[PDB]
């Protein structure tokens, strides 16, 4: 255990076990997240010009969409993998933030929008396994990751 990491040892184990289940179909989860983002905030689709005028069905098999979906889920999965190496976890999350600095139209306030989308994918995929306890833990951990991503953006 490392006190820089937000979760207690018990909560960290709950995260790792739950995520192991969720991670079975990571690319699908990423696709779900981006499609949810575009529902909640249609103007976010405009930040990805390669997707213009394409329906969710046309996107699901699209190569550029597959790439973007993987880019949006991968750092969360890499973060869980690195739960016991905070120094590396911090390097990786701050890099994600730094990578949005020059995205046209991007604002720091947008990172938090991805949180609800990840939560949506977690709820939908885990179904009854998304317990009240897991909801609590995911809210803490997802919030903490966003803060680190934002730090990287502000560097």
Residue nearer to ligand HEM on the CB measure, 124 or 133 = 124
Q: Which residues are annotated as a binding site for heme b?
A: 72, 100
Cβ-based burial of 79 (10 A; exposed 0-12, middle 13-18, buried ≥19): buried
Give burial (CB, 10 Å; 0-12/13-18/19+) of 138.
buried
> Per this entry, what is the length of the chain?
155
Tell me the Cα Rg of the chain.
15
Question: Which of residues 66 and 135 has its CB atom nearest to ligand HEM in the complex?
Answer: 66
Rounded to whole angstroms, how far apart are CA atoms 112 and 145?
Answer: 10
> Which is nearer to ligand HEM, 48 or 144 (by Cβ)?
48
Please say whether the beta carbons of 35 and 117 come within 8 A: no
Q: Which stretch binds ligand HEM (CB under 6 A): 6-14, 20-28, 41-49, 84-92?
A: 41-49
**Ranges within 97-126 binding ligand HEM (CB under 6 A):** 99-100, 103, 110-111, 113-114
Write the binding mask 52 to 81 for ligand HEM: x where contact by CB under 6 A, - elsewhere.
----------------x--xx--xx-----
Residue found under tokens 């329906």: 55
Number of helical H runs and strand E runs in the chain: 7, 0
Smallest gap from Cβ 127 to ligand HEM, in A, equals 23
Site for ligand HEM contains 96 (CB under 6 A):
yes
Residue closer to ligand HEM, measured from CB, 108 or 133: 108
Which residues sit at the interface with ligand HEM, rule CB under 6 A? Answer: 37, 44, 47-48, 68, 71-72, 75-76, 96, 99-100, 103, 110-111, 113-114, 149
């Amino acid at each position: 255990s490392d006190p820089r990491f937000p979760l207690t040892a018990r909560d960290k184990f709950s995260l790792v076990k739950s995520w192991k289940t969720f991670s079975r179909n990571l690319e699908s989860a990423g696709k779900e997240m981006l499609l949810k983002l575009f529902i909640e905030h249609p103007d976010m689709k405009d930040l990805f010009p390669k997707f213009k005028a394409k329906t969710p069905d046309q996107l699901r098999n699209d190569e550029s969409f597959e790439e973007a979906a993987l880019a949006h889920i991968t750092p969360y999965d890499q973060a869980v993998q690195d739960s016991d190496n905070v120094d590396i976890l911090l390097t990786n999350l701050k890099r994600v933030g730094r990578q949005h600095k020059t995205v046209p139209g991007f604002q720091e306030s947008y990172f938090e929008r991805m949180e609800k989308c990840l939560v949506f994918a977690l709820q939908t995929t885990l179904a009854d396994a998304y317990t009240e306890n897991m909801e609590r833990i995911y809210k803490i951990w997802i919030s903490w990751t966003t803060e680190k991503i934002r730090e990287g953006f502000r560097e």
